[PDB]
Amino acid sequence: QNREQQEELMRDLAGSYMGHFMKPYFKDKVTGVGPPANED
DNA sequence: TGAAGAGAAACCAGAGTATACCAGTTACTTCTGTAACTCAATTTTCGGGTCCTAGTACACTGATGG
């Protein structure tokens, strides 16, 4: 349990926003552009 | 018996002479690229926040005047 608490502390140190999920919610991890437009 | 030069002891600039820098170039190296795995250090860049000062909307207030 204590080592799990330590690992939780470390994943807190290694945790990270909401702007990244704005208008183009989906986006490449390469280029960072959304998918093409719908037909709608 | 002076005359026209003869000799003599000073200055004075200048032409070789003496330096005095000032470039003029031959080898003889490193340093590129590519490849790779490694690891850490360092930089770049990149999307998003972050704080701050300055207006802005908006419902309400508070008279105000005719």
UniProtKB/Swiss-Prot annotation:
Q: Where, subcellularly, is it found?
A: Nucleus
Looking at the record's lineage, which domain of life comes first?
Eukaryota
Impact reported for residue 6 to L? Abolishes SNAPC5 binding in the absence of SNAPC1. Minimal effect on SNAPC5 binding in the presence of SNAPC1
Subunit notes for this chain? Part of the SNAPc complex composed of 5 subunits: SNAPC1, SNAPC2, SNAPC3, SNAPC4 and SNAPC5. SNAPC4 interacts with SNAPC1, SNAPC2, SNAPC5, BRF2 and TBP.
| Cited function | Part of the SNAPc complex required for the transcription of both RNA polymerase II and III small-nuclear RNA genes. Binds to the proximal sequence element (PSE), a non-TATA-box basal promoter element common to these 2 types of genes. Recruits TBP and BRF2 to the U6 snRNA TATA box.
Disease connection: Neurodevelopmental disorder with motor regression, progressive spastic paraplegia, and oromotor dysfunction: An autosomal recessive disorder characterized by delayed motor development and developmental regression after the first year of life, followed by progressive spasticity with gait alterations, paraparesis, and oromotor dysfunction. Most individuals have cerebral, cerebellar, or basal ganglia volume loss.
Q: From the Swiss-Prot or TrEMBL record, give the protein name.
A: snRNA-activating protein complex subunit 4
Q: What is the species listed in this Swiss-Prot or TrEMBL entry? A: Homo sapiens
By which gene is this protein encoded?
SNAPC4
Q: Which residues of the full protein are shown?
A: 110 to 164 of 1469
